[PDB]
Design a binder for this molecule. Structure first.
Ligand SMILES: [Ca+2]
Ligand SMILES: [Ca+2]
Ligand SMILES: [Mg+2]
Ligand SMILES: [Mg+2]
Lengths: 1055, 989
């Protein structure tokens, strides 16, 4: 009928085979689907028809005359009977395979119409009127004489397989020279760089296709060296080219890496089946370059970027390498349906939050909902290790979602009177889905000050660990309480408390055996772009400081996110070291209500408007991969709607409804004798020995100094079964060489803690007490935060933090302002933390003088904190004992001495410790013990602290019976009743003065000057002030000035 | 006769002499090794002189005795006693060691033949056994102070060259990545285990032996893959990564930077010239003499001794010299107190007369540095700082950035030289523990904060007062935080001043090449206690037993120069003579002792908002704002946001530099500023106020608008801006809080620098802190800038504290600030919802015919027809609450109530206030009205000071506020609303 002729061509299929492997490897790992050789051959024909429109024509007799007809389109016929893919000439690869699979998913489903069989112009068959040519495709074969040759002879010799293409053409309208060029052009296309560049583009494959190049003539040994160079480059910096960004904002990311490029390493497609020696665990092993490269891609350049070759410990690097480079089994369909059920719950909660309430756009997890399945994997993996509890600290973003879907709190409890709910703590229990374990989950309170909670969490976890006898101060080394700390990308990079907290990771006094860090990196900080937020590649680069492994993961891949979360928990359990997970995601909405984020970030938000949610993309991925059926997916949408329904239904229902501190002589003597009950063969430093000896003397003979009075209070608490945690900068010895809580053996360096002996009763039995004394790192913010957190974690522990000088505590202002002074009023979170602040005007300058009493007195409100400035060692002793034993959890701020530690007048009698209590107001001993007349007094000086001793000395020298000195030991809360009882004893006073060392604008005057004549107007109306002049600094810089100012105060007081 | 393999002998001698040439000096002969082996009792040495009592000699003593006999044969001073008393002798004969490339591969070594019956043949066998013995070469090395493991006599690995080459390449990577973990960087050598601990760096655990040393291996590089001898490979690796310099660089993500370091560190360095060594030693002499003087002539000056860290002086000298070599303009130094006066004398170059005439450890200085060998000059300056360690780090950065911008260098300059260099010193404990370090390091490459690289020197004395490094950091080095910005780290032996100078110059070269920070960890020690009376052996007895055996850097360096044969004994005597002279002159020198603008200006700033670049696409929500601004500039009703840009714009137009920055400051936290507008289609930025930097005639005004979005930090950002105003006193510098509630994260900068720098150091700053403040029901962290705290820090003329209630009063406040010729910080409590209040708007005449009013009256009494005589109750207030009290007064129509605003809280406008109150003669009660709790806002201050400062007006002043609270406000909006109505009701009750 059609006089036909044939033209045959043997085409190399090596690039075709190789790129199909890359394409289907990708699809398998991503959204699913399988590209056939027919897809590639069919599309090539359609492109070759563009260079040769005559191969598309067909013979006809139109008006008795032989004619060649130019059809309107390229309608490629395919043997399925031949069905037509219409209008192929205006199709991109993606459109063509969609059209190809449309006809195919209808031949199988029996939904093909007569229209699908008409109008074919060219066709393809896989072993004629109205069509000019039929292209035939043979099976992939080796050239004759190479059939039966070893798979390694084929590899060594560089022999590839061949497709024989045939072209049966109408010789009335097509020339044999043209037909041959058509096949030569399909040959060229199926070896062409740009051809495979488009196929990859159109399938979303970010990797460079396998390239048709000439086989490198170098030896296997020389190439092997380059393979090993390439393995090291992926391991070290493969993370720089990983497909971690769900938005793919930076196109350039997947190129211009000569270090990871196979082609710039003298390797070609011809080496893919060649075997190369690679060193590892089982020693040297021979592997196919193809396998080497696919493992490297899967491990370092897909949805997970691994940073680990910065870790100085080789064992840890091998550990990560082994787990990340092994062929790890795909999750079970039950495991995938579980991850999807979590995404359903996360997305339903988010949808509800933004629908049912206004002003919730700032807490939106929309674009970051994978954090919920990720956090679930973390907590489940901790339960798998049989751990006790997971304590979470996080900012406001997604917090109520974490309460519902992670802490497991009911909607009735979360939304009762729906804000402060984004700052309060919670406790729940997590039950394993597949496993048989349960774990406690708790969330800690936090302010709006980003990252400020980081050290608080650590302190709180450490207190729980110590109680559970786990970790550092525990019999086991499990650290069965896990810190899970969330962060945002901008705050993690810019806030210093992060480096300060990371620095505590492995310290004896602060370690919690590793923290799991999750950074919700939405690549934005309110209005700010990452280039204005950090001077480094990743927001997590600060974690490299402690050599922590960093995992950058694609927030659109909840399988990779869960896998990484579990790996993180396993590393932490293995090395007791912090792990950071950088979850790359996006913020779908504006920062707050009304905000149009395209005002400042138009590019990012044009891209975000084209993004479908994690849940819909994950469901589609599962379908396309053949992991779930359409029915299984319909059930998933049914589950999402059910979740969305019960959250609306549950909140709808709720809206329809809604004191003796004295000790015995035996106790004093026991604490004193402990200082000499040295271990066998212990060599005390010759300068330390007189101190131990003076302490035994003091405990028996009196004249107790401040430093010993402190150890007497702490020692007696330990003896009574209390945990005592003391720490600060150089706190083991004391800044002023006064504590000696820990004494070092002069010859061996062995440490001895005398107060630890009090943890054992005289009969040998433990008391239950403990003395935990540490030298802190050189930080104020993290240390103060840690101790605050510790008291919250263990309310029965006596927790003390000591400033080197009270002048440096301003470095912890966020903690004081946001947690210590206000946590009870704001969150109902109680703390019994003690801040020891060395204070006193001694002529050492503006940074060695003041603890800023005036600032604490300003933060104070009825029952928030206790503020005291004791003038005697025994009053300090009773203050600490009262604090530890009152059953009240309220912070105590103490203004402690420096030179008054060695003042021989500031000493206490044994009866002051055994027959007294804390005195909030103190009188001169001459009126309470001696033979002094209070009626002779006409001038009353009210003071606090060390200046009492100078005013007392002056009164004694001049012998002034008309002047009395009254001390306010407890500055806040004011001892109104005790102060009134005292002043009533001086009936002939004609003038009262508040006397202080500090500038007029500092100390207690700004407070007392205003409140004392208000609180007690019958006693203090007309109260005058004697102080230093108001200053913009805590003191003068000159010692000589200080001395003149100090004498001015005493002269005025007695003038 | 006996033929012996002397391969281990040759190999270890190469290692021995390679070590000695670099360190202490001297050359070990084969005769030293053979002679000592024989001994293992007087050994005769051939003309045959004896070494007596060899049996009680260690290797070092034997070589000393051996060379003591050589210095008697050469010097002709041998006595008869030196020839009488011998036991055994050596000349025992000794034969010479006999293709050069074909022999290396077969594993054949050189043979040495020995001579002299059975016990004689056994003695040559005991000699044989010793030259291939571990413990022998182990003790020889320990005696010569060599910290490395000797070459071992092991059996040749039977594996192929290709297989070994792979293990060689693994080993090269191991040294490059982790070799620093094995470097001789500790002058005290406290950790013995250091040179054994690593199988990763061990040649023997890599299937390589001494038999592979002369075997060639293929190694890739810059000029391509080249064949090198394993011994050459290993010696280069050791010299580069395991001697006195530990290099950390493989963590750097930029390859061109890693190659750069690799090339400079792995090339064969030429030894310094004797002039260069005598110069380094002259600097150590000056440093040690100054220290000796300081501890002799003064007591209490032990707190800041550099004793054990004096190499920091030659190191810092190399840094500054290298900056002068690059022809840079200035080096600005920030450092703690340790060694500060030494830096003043020997680095800043201040005379002893100026230094010694304490506060001196906190004040700034300026000097000029002149090159020794070079022909250049460079300015050297030191900045003021508190005792708060590391807090100056951001201040230095801000101060360098201000100087760079003035010099038209770097980021806001025509050149990319960054000709002003930050040189920041630190201590090991503070660098690791203080967060402001990470916050400052984070600014390194930001557009708004970059200074083109900071040189960091960490004076690492391996102690932090009484605290040991294990209690101070959770990482290997105190410098590990620098890895955050991918900065190269160099760990250097403080006892080797040549390596310290070399590293300093390399650091300056890297910084100039990549405009990125470089950290030098100088390992040293603290010879004395932390301060005075301190016996450091109470807490660190081990470290201090070791330190008591250490001879100083100067004696150590002079002895090494002698040993190496770099200087003669006379040249060393001159060096002690120089030290003595330096010590003498230091003792001898000290012994001798209108804001209004015109309509044209307003209109120009307004028109600028629409003078868009050609083809610019404004966001549709931004366009109405630009249009309203042109309208406001011509028609009035000027809002707060525009009033601010009117003040800044007019300053730029008058030739002033204006630097504005904070979190999301380009747009504004409340979408109100729009200082920078982003092109909807291209992302291109447009800054309308920059147009004002050019006069109508086209000429530049000299002004500039530098507006930035800060990083998410308060401490570093506030510090940076404080520093900026100090570096450029003629610049208008503003820092904006997101909410005034977050500025407490910058408390150290407020307390130590801003509020007190003038009183303490004489250091003036004109910095402006913008703190969004107000009770609006948003919670305790979105309400207060803590007015009460600033008012407490204030003392006559330290700062200005204001809370303006109108856009024009804010405008005049900023203009007064920028134009008063006074350098004093300004704290402004700015609005949030009052930005959009239609009543809080200003008229054009308020900008053109007025000035800043510190005290404001109700417009009805100053413009309207209101009677002040009708008033019996006076309400004193400040800020937004005025509008609610005014609305309430208007509603109820209350002529008997007057509202007076205190716009300037500090310093109190005593005269303006009295003048005003005197106009209300029938007032029967005065109240201070505030939104804040009783213990906060201005009441704690005003309640005490107003009845003191003006007793005839304010005795009897009562308060109307919220109750005292432990937080700035309630957490509930509903509570806030009830409390807010309570205030208004009480005020009008
Ligand atoms: Ca308590
Ligand atoms: Ca000014
Ligand atoms: Mg973010
Ligand atoms: Mg130190």
């Amino acid at each position: 009928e059609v006089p036909t002729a044939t033209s045959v061509r043997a085409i190399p299929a090596k690039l075709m085979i190789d790129n199909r492997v890359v394409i289907n490897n990708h699809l398998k790992r991503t959204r699913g689907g399988k590209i056939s050789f027919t897809h590639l051959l069919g599309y090539a024909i359609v492109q070759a028809v563009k260079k040769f429109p005559n191969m598309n024509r067909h013979f006809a007799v139109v008006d008795g005359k032989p004619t060649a007809i130019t059809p309107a389109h390229t309608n490629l016929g395919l043997a399925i009977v031949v069905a037509a893919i219409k209008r192929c000439e205006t199709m991109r690869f993606g459109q063509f395979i969609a059209a190809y699979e449309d006809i195919v998913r209808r031949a199988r489903d029996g939904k093909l119409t007569a229209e699908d069989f008409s109008g074919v112009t060219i066709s393809l068959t896989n072993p004629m009127q109205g069509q000019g040519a039929i292209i035939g495709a043979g099976a992939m074969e080796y050239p004759a004489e190479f059939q039966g040759a070893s798979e390694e002879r084929i590899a060594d010799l560089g022999i590839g397989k061949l497709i024989t293409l045939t072209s049966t053409y109408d010789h009335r309208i097509i020339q044999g020279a043209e037909s041959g060029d058509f096949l030569r052009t399909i040959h060229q296309l199926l070896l062409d760089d740009d051809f495979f560049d488009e196929i990859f583009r159109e399938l979303g494959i970010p990797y460079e296709p396998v390239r048709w190049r000439t086989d490198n003539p170098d030896s296997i040994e020389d190439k092997n060296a380059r393979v090993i160079e390439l393995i090291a480059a992926y391991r070290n910096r493969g993370h720089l080219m990983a497909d971690i960004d769900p938005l793919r904002l930076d196109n350039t990311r997947f190129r211009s890496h000569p270090d990871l490029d196979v082609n710039s390493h003298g390797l070609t497609l011809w080496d893919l089946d060649r075997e190369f020696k690679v060193d590892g665990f089982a020693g040297v092993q021979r592997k196919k370059l193809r396998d080497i490269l696919s493992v490297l891609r899967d491990a370092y350049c897909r949805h997970v970027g691994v940073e680990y070759t910065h870790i100085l410990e080789p064992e840890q690097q091998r550990w990560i390498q082994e787990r990340v480079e092994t062929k790890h089994d795909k999750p079970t369909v039950a495991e995938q349906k579980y991850i999807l059920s979590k995404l359903n719950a996360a997305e339903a909660f988010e949808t509800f939050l933004q629908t049912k309430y206004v002003g919730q756009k700032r807490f939106s997890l929309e674009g970051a909902e994978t954090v919920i399945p990720m956090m679930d994997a973390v907590i489940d993996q901790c339960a798998e290790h049989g751990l006790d509890e997971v304590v979470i600290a996080m900012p406001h973003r997604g917090r109520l979602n974490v309460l519902a879907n992670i802490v497991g709190k009911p909607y009735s409890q979360i939304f009762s009177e729906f804000d402060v709910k984004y700052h309060l703590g919670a406790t729940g229990t997590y039950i394993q889905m597949f496993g048989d374990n349960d774990i406690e989950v708790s969330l800690t309170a936090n302010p709006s000050h980003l990252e400020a909670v980081d050290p608080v969490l650590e302190g709180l976890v450490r207190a729980k660990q110590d109680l559970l006898d786990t970790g550092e101060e525990g019999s086991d080394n499990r650290f069965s309480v896990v810190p899970l700390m969330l962060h945002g990308d901008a705050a993690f990079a810019g806030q210093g408390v992060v480096a300060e907290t990371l620095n505590l990771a492995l310290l004896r006094g602060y370690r919690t055996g590793g923290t799991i860090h999750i950074v919700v990196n939405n690549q934005i900080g309110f209005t700010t772009a990452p280039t204005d937020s950090r001077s480094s590649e990743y927001c997590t680069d600060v974690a490299k400081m402690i050599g922590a492994p960093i995992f950058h993961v694609n927030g659109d891949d909840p399988e990779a996110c869960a896998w990484v979360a579990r790996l993180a928990v396993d590393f932490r359990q293995a090395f007791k070291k912090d792990v950071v997970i950088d979850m790359l995601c996006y913020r779908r909405r504006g920062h707050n209500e009304g905000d149009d984020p395209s005002m400042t970030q138009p590019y990012m938000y044009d891209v975000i408007d084209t993004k479908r949610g994690s849940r819909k993309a994950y469901t589609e991925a599962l379908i396309g991969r053949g992991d779930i059926s359409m029915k299984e997916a319909e059930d998933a949408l049914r589950d999402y709607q059910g979740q969305l329904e019960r959250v609306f239904n549950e909140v709808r229902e709720l809206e329809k409804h809604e004191l003796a501190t004295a000790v015995d002589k035996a106790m004093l003597q026991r604490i004193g004798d402990a200082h000499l009950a040295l271990p066998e063969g212990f060599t005390v430093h010759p300068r330390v020995r007189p101190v131990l000896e003076k302490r035994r003397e003091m405990a028996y003979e009196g004249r107790i100094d401040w430093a010993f009075a402190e150890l007497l209070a702490l020692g007696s608490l330990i003896a009574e079964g209390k945990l005592v945690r003391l720490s600060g900068q150089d706190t083991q010895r004391g800044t002023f060489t006064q504590r000696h809580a820990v004494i070092v053996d002069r010859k061996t360096g062995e440490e001895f803690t005398p107060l630890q002996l009090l943890a054992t009763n005289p009969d040998g039995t433990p008391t239950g007490g403990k003395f935990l004394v540490y030298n802190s790192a050189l930080s104020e913010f993290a240390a103060v935060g840690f101790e605050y957190g510790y008291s919250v974690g263990n309310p029965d522990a006596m927790v003390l933090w000591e400033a080197q000088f009270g002048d440096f505590v301003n470095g912890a202002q966020s903690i004081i302002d946001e947690f210590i002074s206000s946590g009870e009023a704001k969150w109902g979170q109680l703390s019994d933390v003690v801040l020891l602040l060395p204070h006193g005007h001694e002529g050492q300058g503006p940074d060695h003088t003041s603890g800023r009493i005036e600032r604490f007195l300003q933060l104070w409100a009825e029952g928030s904190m206790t503020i005291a400035m004791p003038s005697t060692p025994a009053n300090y002793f009773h203050l600490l004992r009262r604090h530890g034993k009152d059953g009240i959890q309220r912070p105590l701020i103490v203004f402690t001495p420096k030179s008054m530690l060695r003042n021989k007048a500031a000493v206490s009698d044994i009866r002051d410790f055994t027959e007294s209590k804390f005195r909030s107001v103190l009188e001169e001993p001459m009126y309470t013990d001696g033979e002094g007349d209070r009626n002779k007094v006409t001038r009353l000086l009210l003071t606090s602290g060390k200046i009492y001793y100078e005013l007392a000395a002056r009164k004694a020298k001049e012998n002034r019976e008309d002047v009395a000195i009254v001390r306010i030991e407890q500055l806040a809360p004011l001892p109104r009743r005790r102060l009134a009882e005292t002043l009533d004893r001086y009936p002939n006073v004609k003038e009262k003065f508040w006397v202080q060392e500090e500038p007029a604008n500092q100390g207690a005057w700004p407070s007392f000057g205003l409140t004392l004549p208000e609180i007690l107007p019958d006693h203090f109306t007309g109260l005058k002030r004697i102080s230093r002049r108001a200053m913009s600094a805590p003191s003068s810089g000159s010692s000589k000035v200080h001395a003149v100012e100090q004498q001015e105060i005493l002269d005025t007081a007695f003038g």
